[PDB]
Scaffold this motif. Structure first.
Motif, PDB file in Angstrom:
ATOM      1  N   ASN A 259     -30.512 -22.537  -3.720  1.00  0.00           N
ATOM      2  CA  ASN A 259     -31.491 -21.819  -2.918  1.00  0.00           C
ATOM      3  C   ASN A 259     -30.806 -20.783  -2.027  1.00  0.00           C
ATOM      4  OD1 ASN A 259     -31.335 -22.903   0.038  1.00  0.00           O
ATOM      5  ND2 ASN A 259     -33.387 -21.993  -0.098  1.00  0.00           N
ATOM      6  N   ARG A 260     -31.279 -19.539  -2.120  1.00  0.00           N
ATOM      7  CA  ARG A 260     -30.739 -18.401  -1.373  1.00  0.00           C
ATOM      8  C   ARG A 260     -30.621 -18.627   0.129  1.00  0.00           C
ATOM      9  NH1 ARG A 260     -31.541 -13.408  -4.411  1.00  0.00           N
ATOM     10  NH2 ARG A 260     -29.646 -14.416  -5.219  1.00  0.00           N
ATOM     11  N   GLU A 261     -31.643 -19.221   0.731  1.00  0.00           N
ATOM     12  CA  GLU A 261     -31.581 -19.519   2.151  1.00  0.00           C
ATOM     13  C   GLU A 261     -30.572 -20.664   2.185  1.00  0.00           C
ATOM     14  OE1 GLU A 261     -36.386 -18.653   2.471  1.00  0.00           O
ATOM     15  OE2 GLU A 261     -35.571 -20.636   2.964  1.00  0.00           O
ATOM     16  N   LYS A 262     -30.321 -21.263   3.339  1.00  0.00           N
ATOM     17  CA  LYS A 262     -29.344 -22.353   3.379  1.00  0.00           C
ATOM     18  C   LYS A 262     -28.008 -21.897   2.774  1.00  0.00           C
ATOM     19  CE  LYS A 262     -33.329 -24.332   4.209  1.00  0.00           C
ATOM     20  NZ  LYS A 262     -32.913 -24.735   5.583  1.00  0.00           N
ATOM     21  N   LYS A 263     -27.736 -20.600   2.874  1.00  0.00           N
ATOM     22  CA  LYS A 263     -26.499 -20.027   2.365  1.00  0.00           C
ATOM     23  C   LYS A 263     -25.410 -20.270   3.402  1.00  0.00           C
ATOM     24  CE  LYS A 263     -28.173 -15.607   4.169  1.00  0.00           C
ATOM     25  NZ  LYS A 263     -28.509 -14.175   3.923  1.00  0.00           N
ATOM     26  N   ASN A 264     -25.838 -20.614   4.613  1.00  0.00           N
ATOM     27  CA  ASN A 264     -24.919 -20.893   5.713  1.00  0.00           C
ATOM     28  C   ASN A 264     -24.283 -22.252   5.455  1.00  0.00           C
ATOM     29  OD1 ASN A 264     -27.462 -22.375   6.312  1.00  0.00           O
ATOM     30  ND2 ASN A 264     -26.372 -22.951   8.191  1.00  0.00           N
ATOM     31  N   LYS A 265     -24.602 -22.820   4.298  1.00  0.00           N
ATOM     32  CA  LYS A 265     -24.087 -24.123   3.922  1.00  0.00           C
ATOM     33  C   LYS A 265     -22.979 -24.042   2.897  1.00  0.00           C
ATOM     34  CE  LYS A 265     -26.285 -26.960   6.468  1.00  0.00           C
ATOM     35  NZ  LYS A 265     -27.184 -27.915   5.756  1.00  0.00           N
ATOM     36  N   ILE A 266     -22.572 -22.833   2.522  1.00  0.00           N
ATOM     37  CA  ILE A 266     -21.527 -22.740   1.515  1.00  0.00           C
ATOM     38  C   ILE A 266     -20.205 -23.326   2.001  1.00  0.00           C
ATOM     39  CG2 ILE A 266     -22.655 -20.691   0.524  1.00  0.00           C
ATOM     40  CD1 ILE A 266     -20.414 -18.962   1.543  1.00  0.00           C
ATOM     41  N   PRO A 267     -19.836 -23.102   3.276  1.00  0.00           N
ATOM     42  CA  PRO A 267     -18.558 -23.685   3.706  1.00  0.00           C
ATOM     43  C   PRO A 267     -18.595 -25.198   3.529  1.00  0.00           C
ATOM     44  CG  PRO A 267     -19.212 -21.978   5.210  1.00  0.00           C
ATOM     45  CD  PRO A 267     -20.427 -22.296   4.359  1.00  0.00           C
ATOM     46  N   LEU A 309     -15.024 -22.753   8.896  1.00  0.00           N
ATOM     47  CA  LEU A 309     -16.320 -22.091   8.799  1.00  0.00           C
ATOM     48  C   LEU A 309     -17.486 -23.051   8.993  1.00  0.00           C
ATOM     49  CD1 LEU A 309     -15.853 -19.636   5.810  1.00  0.00           C
ATOM     50  CD2 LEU A 309     -15.596 -19.208   8.259  1.00  0.00           C
ATOM     51  N   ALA A 310     -17.404 -24.224   8.373  1.00  0.00           N
ATOM     52  CA  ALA A 310     -18.473 -25.211   8.490  1.00  0.00           C
ATOM     53  C   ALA A 310     -18.687 -25.661   9.935  1.00  0.00           C
ATOM     54  CB  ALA A 310     -18.173 -26.411   7.607  1.00  0.00           C
ATOM     55  N   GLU A 311     -17.608 -26.003  10.632  1.00  0.00           N
ATOM     56  CA  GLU A 311     -17.726 -26.442  12.020  1.00  0.00           C
ATOM     57  C   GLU A 311     -18.241 -25.274  12.851  1.00  0.00           C
ATOM     58  OE1 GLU A 311     -13.675 -27.729  13.089  1.00  0.00           O
ATOM     59  OE2 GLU A 311     -14.087 -29.588  12.007  1.00  0.00           O
TER      60      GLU A 311
END
Ligand SMILES: CCCc1nn(C)c2c(=O)[nH]c(-c3cc(S(=O)(=O)N4CCN(C)CC4)ccc3OCC)nc12
Ligand SMILES: [Mg+2]
Ligand SMILES: [Zn+2]
Length: 313
Positions: A259-267, A309-311
Motif C-alpha cells: 500500500n502506497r500510504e504507510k510508506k513511512n514504514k519502509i525502514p 530511520l525507523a526510530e
C-alpha cells in the motif's frame, strides 16, 4: 541490427576497468551498452567463452535478447536487477573465491540463471506454497531465448553437458523463489552450525547453489547505503504500484507492504526483511568462504541505517 553491430564491434574493457569484481559495484551510471559489455567481460573472465567455444556475435545477440525480454516500465524487476544479480555472482566467484569450489558447468549455468532468473517479470510479486509459478515462467523464458536461432550460446556443449547445464539452470532459477529459500535454508544453516557442511556432497552442492542464487538475487540489500536506498525505493515503487493496480482491478486492499500510504514504514520493514531473510544467509555464506564478508558486512551497515530511520520516523 544496428545495436547488435555496435555491441559486437565495441572493445570490451577489463574487469578491473569495469570494476565488476567488487561487491560494492553500482550500475546506476552505466549505459545499457556498458552493461552488455560488462556482461561479456563476465562470461569472458570466467573462461566460459573459450572453454565452451562461444561465438562472439552469438553471445552478443543472446545478451541483447535477454536484456530485451525485461520490461523497463517495471520499477525493480527489469534488466538492471538481472544484471546486478549476475554482477554479484561474478564478484562472489572472483573476489569471494567461490570459483574454485564449482565446476565450469555449474558456473556457466549460474551466470546464465542470474541473468535470466526474472525474465519477462510483469511486476506481480508475492509475499513469503505457490509452487513457484512465476519462476517457472522465467525459466521457460530463458530456455526459449537459449534455443532461438542466432542466440544459441549453449551450442558447443555435448548433449550430456547441455542436459546437465539445463537441469542446473532450471534449479538455479527456481531457487530464486523465496518460498523455496525458506523451505531449504534450515538444513543449510544446520550444517554450517554443526560445522559439517560438505560441498563434496551432491545434495549439499545443489543446496549451496540455491543459497548462492538467492544471495546474489538480494545483493542490493548489501550494497553501500546510497545504492541500497536508491534500489530500495525502486522495490517500494513496484510494490505500491502493484497494490494500487491490484485494488483497481480487484476490489482488494493492499497489505502494508504494497500500500502506497504507510510508506513511512519502509525502514521498519527493511529491517524486518533483513533480519528474517538476509543476515542469516550472508553470514552463513561467510562460513563457506570468508572472502564474502563484504556482503555480510554491507548488510549489517544497511540494517543500522534503516534502524535509524525507523526510530527517527
Ligand atoms: C521480490 C523482492 C524481494 C526483495 N529483494 N530485495 C532487494 C528486497 C528488499 O530490499 N526489500 C523487500 C521488502 C520485503 C518486505 S517483507 O515482506 O519481507 N516485510 C519484512 C519482514 N516481514 C515481517 C513482513 C514485511 C517489506 C518491504 C520490502 O521493501 C520495501 C522497499 N523485498 C526485497
Ligand atoms: Mg524473481
Ligand atoms: Zn530477482
Amino acid at each position: 541490427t544496428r545495436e547488435l553491430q555496435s555491441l559486437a564491434a565495441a572493445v570490451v574493457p577489463s574487469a578491473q576497468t569495469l570494476k565488476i569484481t567488487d561487491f560494492s559495484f553500482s550500475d546506476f551510471e552505466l549505459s545499457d551498452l556498458e552493461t552488455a559489455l560488462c556482461t561479456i567481460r563476465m562470461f569472458t573472465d570466467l573462461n566460459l567463452v573459450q572453454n565452451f567455444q562461444m561465438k562472439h556475435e552469438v553471445l552478443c545477440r543472446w545478451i541483447l535478447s535477454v536484456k530485451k525480454n525485461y520490461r523497463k516500465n517495471v520499477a525493480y524487476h527489469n534488466w538492471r536487477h538481472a544484471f546486478n544479480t549476475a554482477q554479484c555472482m561474478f564478484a562472489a566467484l572472483k573476489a569471494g573465491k567461490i570459483q574454485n569450489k564449482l565446476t565450469d558447468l555449474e558456473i556457466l549455468a549460474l551466470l546464465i540463471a542470474a541473468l535470466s532468473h526474472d525474465l519477462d517479470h510483469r511486476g506481480v510479486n508475492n509475499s513469503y506454497y505457490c509452487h513457484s509459478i512465476m519462476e517457472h515462467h522465467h525459466f521457460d523464458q530463458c530456455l526459449m531465448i537459449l534455443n532461438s536461432p542466432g542466440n544459441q550460446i549453449l551450442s558447443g556443449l555435448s548433449i550430456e553437458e547441455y542436459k546437465t547445464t539445463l537441469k542446473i539452470i532450471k534449479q538455479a532459477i527456481l531457487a530464486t523463489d523465496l518460498a523455496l529459500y525458506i523451505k531449504r535454508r534450515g538444513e543449510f544453516f544446520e550444517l554450517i552450525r554443526k560445522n559439517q557442511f560438505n560441498l563434496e556432497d551432491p545434495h549439499q552442492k545443489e543446496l549451496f547453489l540455491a543459497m548462492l542464487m538467492t544471495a546474489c538475487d538480494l545483493s542490493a540489500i548489501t550494497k553501500p547505503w546510497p545504492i541500497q536506498q536508491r534500489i530500495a525505493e525502486l522495490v517500494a515503487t513496484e510494490f505500491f504500484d502493484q497494490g494500487d493496480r491490484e485494488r483497481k482491478e480487484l476490489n482488494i486492499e493492499p497489505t502494508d507492504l504494497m500500500n502506497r500510504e504507510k510508506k513511512n514504514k519502509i525502514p521498519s520493514m527493511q529491517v524486518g526483511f533483513i533480519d528474517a531473510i538476509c543476515l542469516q544467509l550472508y553470514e552463513a555464506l561467510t562460513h563457506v568462504s570468508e572472502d564474502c564478508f563484504p556482503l555480510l558486512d554491507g548488510c549489517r551497515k544497511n540494517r543500522q541505517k534503516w534502524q535509524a530511520l525507523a526510530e527517527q520516523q
